[PDB]
Design a protein around this ligand. Structure first.
Ligand code: BCL
Ligand code: BCL
Ligand code: BCL
Ligand code: BCL
Ligand code: BCL
Ligand code: BCL
Ligand code: BCL
Ligand code: BPH
Ligand code: BPH
Ligand code: SPO
Ligand code: FE2
Lengths: 250, 42, 48, 304, 281, 42, 42, 48, 48, 42, 42, 42, 42, 42, 42, 42
């Protein structure tokens, strides 16, 4: 063509591509809301778009997104600063009202579905696919919490197929009332486990999975969020915790 | 069905007479022969 | 004390004895007092 | 022999399962590929299956005689010994019809011969593997975006030795074949055209390869970082917003000054994609029929 | 301003020993303990584009230059715009690289998202260092460095980049390119591995990770899953730098000679030693 | 929603009219005839 | 209504006119006619 | 609790309280100055 | 527990003992300290 | 009211002026023709 | 304690005087026409 | 029943009319032997 | 079997011919002597 | 079974008239000895 | 057995001596040595 | 058991010598002197 032409169909057709792209990343989350439930300051120079129709993978409805954004779930932060900016603090203990570092959400009562007609995440006593029948095999060992004391005993694995993976490590209590705990934080070396998140006397505060085989998408929010609750506060202030929570490497 | 309608047959009917129209106008102006909007002195 | 709805906060008189009492400090010491700096300016030196 | 259960990952293998069925095929995909169960506790461990139809093996063959044509011009000077071959597996060379030949395929085997075959076959290998990513997203019910970052990728292949060396008319105007021969060629298009720094079409394509690592240094970080929660499952985090759009969607807005939708984090990542070899194909279709010496470009459209 | 769900997440702390003295959320941005630090670093840094705009010459960041010191002045300082004033820009740059990757921890410890992010900028901390610290401390003086500009360090890398013949013969460089073109090799299918299921062609039911296992196993014979390509983006994008900071930690300080003359250490072998074969023969 | 109010005028609109002002000046301050600043002597 | 101050008017809004003021005190010093204190020696 | 359906706000009678306090009068005198501080500048300095 | 009225926290009487002793004293302990220090700054060295 | 008094009223003025004074010195040092030590070097 | 004594000024002021010490070591020990210890050869 | 129909007719209909003409246009547009619009006077 | 029929019947008919035709229709026009559309002239 | 009956003879045979054929076409075309289309006037 | 009977004989007929003959012809036609069919003109 | 009787000696033995004969032929064949198929003419 010429020496001065083509750089202009670009300073224009793309000079609004940070503009068109940003809104497409500003679907979820927006609109902006204040610290109570209020049409907030604004949105930005790239305001949120009015959503298109969303078809769901296993007939879960006309869930358009951005979707539910209001105040369905319970929140409990005592507003320290009524002015918008300065943070807020929970009522009693922050690991009971569910506010701060430990987050969850209320969803519909249909768990994540694949395509076989069955659910996603099941234990090893819900899939006789791979077993134990050679030598001595380790699925059943004692554990330890962040308080540096024994916490329970894990003797099972929640299996995966499409990813061939794992998501939880189930703990047999003295009783049997169900409990749960994430997968990536873990740091196991020899013959005993060490978790560095929650103390060994705060594991019952983790909800019993309504079913020991099923994880509904409603439940999969606090169950992998309570450990994040103990990654912020824990732990004031003096002595052993200073030689436990800090330092380290990995 | 087929493709988007309340999405694709309207807001994309612009680049039909924009991106196409612009990079065809650009050439027929910068040509030594055309100009047309340059002839005045005579 | 927590809030819920539009358009708190807000609100009053956390808006009356507060927001009215600090914003004009940024909208006078720089609105008409900024035209007091215009003193040694409007004549020095647009005209040479 | 038993598969074990070690300490901290963890894993469980998979028996006999594939994927989905609709517009694909039944009696074409071969036997269940043998599983590489060798410390496969990190990622996955599953060989097979594979759509081995005529829409894929047309590239296995057309790539192979792209693979053997420069091959029978990589043993031609050695001395007919296996000593000099792997000795100069790179020092060997092969160039297309000369900077004076061009539009005629009358050239024999020698001076510039075994260039006319490798690409001719490769032509229905690349182009028959643009459509092993474009129609296997149709065998189910997905999209076409996977080869629309590829039509942009074979936009840089649309100029090198295709569109420019025929309008202008010569085969030296295409890329020599080897493993170093073209490295003594990537710096050729540099200096002959007066250095391509003041050529901000070749340079913005650069500028679109310096945003592949400003966009995947952190995606490979945070999706591995919000995975303790539930951000590894990228097929249940968008329309049913989980807490992974909460540890990763408050994390970046506070930081650099904006976040993104679980779907929109794949809208920029394919916008620093269909714009790399696309702004390369233009910035190399604008180099050879616009202004050669780009130092005599970037001082008259740059400083002047 | 804050988001709709940004209600429960608001909690003070994150910072270490001292209190919540610096952690005030100025707008959509985080001003933790390293927040006002970067406020101190970003305010002085805009002036560093404008200082040698009256000492070196031009006022436009097109040719603005605060050059690195000379090669031989020793373990010390420099002139000014030609080193001395250059010697001040770095500890802000790097002092601002640091106050950013570590103000993230005041959010990392604040919530509970992982500490693999004070890290993916630390391959950028270990990639800009290899041009300002790793090199010019030993061969003589701080004179072995690049200019900060956007068109000055351009004619510094090319027409002044053939000191070692060609740099393609530089094997790790070329392996740190056997690592780089592979970054958008695996962003191009992964940035499109979540796009076209709710938007298939228009209307169709959404796909799950079993169609992913009939599209990519119907692609290129290897399906490490969906967590094998975020271990396949953080494998494309951090290491093309340690194979380049190793393409240069033994280049110039030990090999300031032709790296085109490195590919004659390969043809020297007792078996085919005294033998000219092909092209070479 | 869509378009709110009480935040744009404080930190954004003051630098929108200013942004609409800035890309205009450095051409009319530097046109072959105009300028109106530096020249006041001759 | 709405909007916030007790946080903004102490460490936030002060760098808005500071983003407007000191960004142009420099410029009135670059010109070789205005300057107002630069050209002193000669 | 937040709000109900489209739009709120809205709303009738809530469309004219904050979309009309610094969005209508903060633009009309901005347009008046685009007439006032422009017509006195419609003459200098085109004519020498 | 958090309270109610204007304004918290806090903290009457602390409108003239906190927001006037370390707030309005800044309009003096430097604002006037500028005026005296500028007598040794304003003339060095804008006049050569 | 609100903001801070025992927290952020003696520190929003310490490094704040250091973020507005001591780094403002670097402008009156970006001079080497004035300058309180570079007058001789002209 | 109004200011924080064993925090903001016991290891944070020792580097606050370290803040204005060595950055100027690359201006005054610099300067293209001073030195007075380096040029013991020319 | 193996591939597609609805997609090819609204979007993949282009790779038959447009991206087969618009590229073959600029070929016979640049040819002197035709010109039409480059006829004018030669 | 292994395959269906009635869908790829419009794509093995519509565009399949030109895949062969596009690589063969243009090995002939390159000669300045033939052309048949350029030589039917002067 | 396996051997594509209503396929390989319909589509893979429809392209092996291009796989076996055209790869040897573009060699004996520009051969002066045969020519048969490139004899010209001499 | 161990290799497929009714599969790798109908479709392997053109992958066995086709990866093989395509690179045995190119040598018995190594040019200036044989000809025999390129002798026509000369 | 231990030694393959079905697999290795039928399908993995047809590639045992294939590994040993295909790369070993491409050495002794077409030397500019020996040849025994090229010089049967020169
Ligand atoms: C003097 C030095 C110049 C310079 C000289 C040049 C020259 C000359 C060129 C470039 C070009 C480019 N430069 Mg530069 N460049 C400079 C600086 C840089 C720097 C840097 C130092 O930061 C980098 C990283 C680069 C790299 C780049 C790229 C951004 C760009 C070409 C992209 C590319 O390689 O696509 C390559 C990808 C393809 C061609 C597509 C490949 C896909 C194919 C079609 C698929 C094949 C199918 C096949 C069958 C698959 C088989 C696989 C099997 C299954 C195994 N340049 C300086 C300023 N650069 C190139 C360009 O195009 O400019 C815009 C170019 O010619
Ligand atoms: C490594 C070999 C060469 C080199 C090779 C190349 C090549 C090739 C390219 C660049 C380009 C650029 N280089 Mg470089 N570059 C070098 C040294 C550096 C260093 C460093 C200090 O180590 C950094 C941080 C950078 C990064 C930069 C950016 C300034 C610029 C665009 C980056 C981009 O688009 O990708 C993603 C990065 C971003 C999106 C970040 C944005 C970077 C911007 C442009 C810099 C901000 C400065 C700004 C104007 C100042 C504002 C301050 C106040 C507000 C006034 N380079 C060395 C000397 N660099 C690209 C270019 O041409 O620029 C247009 C380009 O093609
Ligand atoms: C003679 C021409 C040579 C050549 C000249 C050079 C020179 C010179 C260099 C390289 C370097 C490299 N080359 Mg080379 N190179 C060639 C062409 C290429 C091509 C190509 C395909 O054309 C590729 C892919 C490469 C790739 C490589 C890598 C091996 C290596 C890059 C290291 C690096 O950048 O990390 C460094 C990473 C960073 C600097 C990022 C750090 C991020 C920091 C912390 C953040 C900055 C923030 C910024 C200031 C703010 C801007 C944002 C604003 C707010 C908007 N080169 C040819 C062969 N190349 C470099 C090298 O090997 O040394 C390490 C180098 O110096
Ligand atoms: C006789 C010509 C007058 C003048 C003619 C106008 C006109 C007309 C307008 C302004 C306007 C403005 N002028 Mg004036 N202005 C002049 C040249 C200048 C110079 C200079 C580089 O000398 C400066 C710094 C300014 C400053 C300004 C801005 C404060 C203001 C733009 C509003 C905005 O920010 O959006 N003017 C000369 C002195 N200017 C705009 C404004 O806000 O109204 C006053 C506007 O409409
Ligand atoms: C020689 C003096 C220059 C000049 C150079 C400067 C500089 C420097 C500054 C101002 C600043 C101001 N100038 Mg003035 N200004 C001039 C004439 C104008 C004209 C006009 C042409 O009528 C306009 C619209 C303006 C605009 C303005 C105001 C927006 C501002 C003073 C009030 C405030 O504190 O906020 N200036 C003359 C032409 N102006 C200040 C500012 O913009 O901060 C907000 C500031 O720093
Ligand atoms: C300047 C006019 C050019 C020309 C350039 C084009 C372009 C561009 C197109 C056609 C198109 C057509 N041309 Mg025509 N065409 C010309 C002369 C010919 C000759 C001939 C010389 O005998 C043939 C066989 C053709 C072939 C054809 C038809 C196949 C087609 C019109 C109907 C259709 O859409 O199907 N053209 C003259 C020489 N032709 C259209 C087509 O094939 O795609 C739908 C099309 O876009
Ligand atoms: C005198 C030499 C004749 C000729 C000698 C032969 C012979 C022999 C054969 C063909 C065959 C064919 N010829 Mg013929 N053919 C010629 C040169 C050409 C040219 C050309 C580039 O000029 C073209 C496009 C063709 C076209 C074709 C194909 C349609 C067909 C190949 C069968 C298949 O589809 O697989 N021939 C010249 C004109 N061709 C094969 C065929 O099956 O014909 C129907 C065949 O055996
Ligand atoms: C292998 C590591 C790769 C990488 C990773 C990476 N970069 C990252 C991050 C990560 C994980 C971030 O999290 C952070 C980010 O915000 O995301 C984009 C970032 C980032 N990468 C950026 C740029 C960048 N990264 C680059 C490269 C890379 N980043 C590598 C390829 C490059 C190139 C092309 O080399 C650039 C230009 C920033 C946008 C951002 C860093 C944010 C930050 O830390 O800000 C601190 C800076 C200040 C407070 C300013 C003060 C500095 C002074 C005032 C002036 C500085 C002088 C200097 C010379 C600047 C000149 C710039 C150019 C002219 C060179
Ligand atoms: C946006 C630009 C980025 C990009 C995009 C991109 N690359 C892509 C794609 C996209 C969208 C694909 O869709 C396609 C893909 O499928 O990815 C896996 C691809 C691809 N990019 C690739 C590489 C690649 N990426 C590159 C870079 C980039 N690509 C940029 C980063 C480059 C550069 C820099 O030039 C290259 C070379 C491939 C991994 C893949 C291309 C797939 C393909 O076309 O191959 C066809 C298959 C064959 C040719 C098989 C033949 C094998 C050999 C040729 C024969 C020898 C082996 C054989 C086994 C002999 C043994 C005998 C046996 C029978 C026993
Ligand atoms: C032991 O060794 C054996 C026996 C196995 C044989 C080994 C062979 C070897 C050494 C193979 C090596 C292969 C390698 C590594 C090749 C490397 C290639 C590289 C690095 C780059 C190649 C890039 C591709 C290029 C330059 C192709 C360009 C061609 C085009 C852009 C279009 C070509 C189109 C043409 C020629 C027109 C044909 C089409 C029509 C319609 C006529
Ligand atoms: Fe992804």
């Amino acid at each position: 063509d010429l020496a001065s032409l083509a750089i202009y169909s670009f300073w224009i057709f793309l000079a609004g591509l940070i503009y068109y792209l940003q809104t497409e990343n500003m679907r979820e989350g927006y609109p902006l809301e204040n610290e109570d439930g209020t049409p907030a300051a604004n949105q930005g120079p790239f305001p949120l778009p009015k959503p298109k129709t969303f078809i769901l993978p296993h007939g879960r409805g006309t869930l358009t997104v951005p979707g539910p954004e209001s105040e369905d779930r319970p929140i409990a932060l005592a507003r320290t600063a009524v002015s918008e900016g300065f943070p807020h603090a929970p009522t009693g203990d922050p690991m009971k009202d569910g506010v701060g570092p430990a987050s969850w959400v209320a969803r519909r009562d249909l768990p994540e579905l694949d395509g076989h007609g069955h659910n996603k995440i099941k234990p090893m006593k819900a899939a006789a696919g791979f077993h134990v029948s050679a030598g001595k095999n380790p699925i059943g060992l004692p554990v330890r919490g962040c308080d540096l004391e024994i916490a329970g005993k894990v003797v099972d694995i929640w299996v995966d197929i499409p990813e061939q993976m794992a998501r939880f490590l189930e703990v047999e209590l003295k009783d049997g009332s169900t409990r749960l705990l994430p997968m990536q934080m873990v740091k196991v070396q020899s013959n005993r486990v060490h978790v560095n998140a929650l103390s060994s006397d705060l594991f019952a505060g983790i909800p019993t999975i309504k079913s020991p085989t099923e994880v509904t998408l409603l439940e999969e929010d606090k169950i992998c969020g309570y450990v994040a609750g103990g990654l912020m506060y824990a732990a004031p202030k003096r002595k052993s915790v200073v030689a436990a929570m800090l330092a380290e490497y990995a | 069905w087929m493709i988007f309608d309340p999405r694709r047959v309207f807001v994309a009917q612009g680049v039909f007479l924009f991106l196409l129209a612009v990079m065809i106008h650009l050439i027929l102006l910068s040509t030594p022969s055309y100009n047309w909007l340059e002839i005045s002195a005579a | 004390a927590d809030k819920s709805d539009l358009g708190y906060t807000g609100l009053t008189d956390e808006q009356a004895q507060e927001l009215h009492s600090v914003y004009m400090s940024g909208l006078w010491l720089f609105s008409a007092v900024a035209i007091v700096a215009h003193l040694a300016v409007y004549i020095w030196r647009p005209w040479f | 022999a038993e598969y074990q259960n070690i300490f901290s990952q963890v894993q469980v293998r998979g028996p006999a399962d594939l994927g989905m069925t609709e517009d694909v095929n039944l009696a074409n995909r071969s036997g269940v590929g043998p599983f590489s169960t060798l410390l496969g506790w990190f990622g996955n461990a599953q060989l097979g299956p594979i759509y081995l139809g005529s829409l894929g093996v047309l590239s296995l063959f057309s790539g192979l005689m792209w693979f053997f044509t420069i091959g029978i011009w990589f043993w031609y000077q050695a001395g007919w010994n296996p000593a000099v071959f792997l000795r100069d597996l790179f020092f060997f060379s092969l160039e297309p019809p000369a900077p004076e030949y061009g539009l005629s395929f009358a050239a024999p085997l020698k001076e510039g011969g075994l260039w006319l075959i490798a690409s001719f076959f490769m032509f229905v290998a690349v182009w028959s593997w643009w459509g092993r990513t474009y129609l296997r997203a149709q065998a189910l019910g997905m999209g076409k975006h996977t080869a629309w970052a590829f039509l942009s990728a074979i936009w840089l292949w649309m100029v090198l030795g295709f569109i420019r060396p025929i309008l202008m008319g010569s085969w030296s105007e295409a890329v020599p074949y080897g493993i170093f021969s073209h490295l003594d060629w990537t710096n050729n298009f540099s200096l002959v055209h007066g250095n391509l720094f003041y050529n901000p079409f070749h340079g913005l394509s650069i500028a679109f390869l310096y945003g592949s690592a400003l966009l995947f240094a952190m995606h490979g970080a945070t999706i591995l970082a919000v995975s303790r929660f539930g951000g590894e499952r990228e097929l249940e985090q968008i329309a049913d917003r989980g807490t992974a759009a909460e540890r990763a969607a408050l994390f970046w807005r506070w930081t650099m000054g904006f976040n993104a939708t679980m779907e929109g984090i794949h809208r920029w990542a394919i916008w620093m994609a269909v714009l790399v070899t696309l702004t390369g194909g233009i910035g190399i279709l604008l180099s050879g029929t616009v202004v050669d010496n780009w130092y005599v470009w970037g001082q008259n459209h740059g400083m002047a | 301003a804050l988001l709709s769900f940004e209600r429960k997440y608001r909690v003070p702390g994150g910072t270490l020993v001292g209190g919540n003295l610096f952690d005030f959320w100025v707008g959509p941005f985080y001003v933790g303990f390293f927040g006002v630090a970067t406020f101190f670093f970003a305010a002085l840094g805009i002036i560093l584009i404008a200082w040698s705009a009256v000492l070196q010459g031009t006022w436009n960041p097109q040719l603005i230059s605060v050059y690195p010191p000379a090669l031989e002045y020793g373990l010390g300082g420099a002139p000014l715009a030609k080193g001395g004033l250059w010697q001040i820009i770095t500890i802000c740059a790097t002092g601002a690289f640091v106050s950013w990757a570590l103000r993230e921890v005041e959010i990392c410890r604040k919530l509970g998202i992982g500490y693999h992010i004070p890290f993916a900028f630390a391959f950028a901390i270990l990639a800009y260092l290899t041009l300002v610290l790793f090199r010019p401390v030993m061969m003589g003086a701080w004179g072995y460095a690049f200019p900060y500009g956007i068109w000055t360090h351009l004619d510094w890398v090319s027409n002044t980049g053939y000191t070692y013949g060609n740099f393609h013969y530089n094997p790790a460089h070329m392996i740190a390119i056997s690592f780089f073109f592979t970054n958008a090799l695996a962003l191009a299918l992964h940035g499109a591995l979540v796009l076209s299921a709710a938007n298939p062609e228009k209307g169709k039911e959404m796909r799950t990770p079993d169609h992913e296992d009939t599209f990519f196993r119907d692609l290129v014979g290897y399906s490490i899953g969906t967590l094998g390509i975020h271990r396949l983006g953080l494998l494309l994008s951090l290491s093309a730098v340690f194979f380049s900071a190793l393409c240069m930690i033994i280049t110039g300080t030990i090999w300031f000679d032709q790296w085109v003359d490195w590919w004659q250490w390969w043809v020297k072998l007792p078996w085919w030693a005294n033998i000219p074969g092909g092209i070479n023969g």
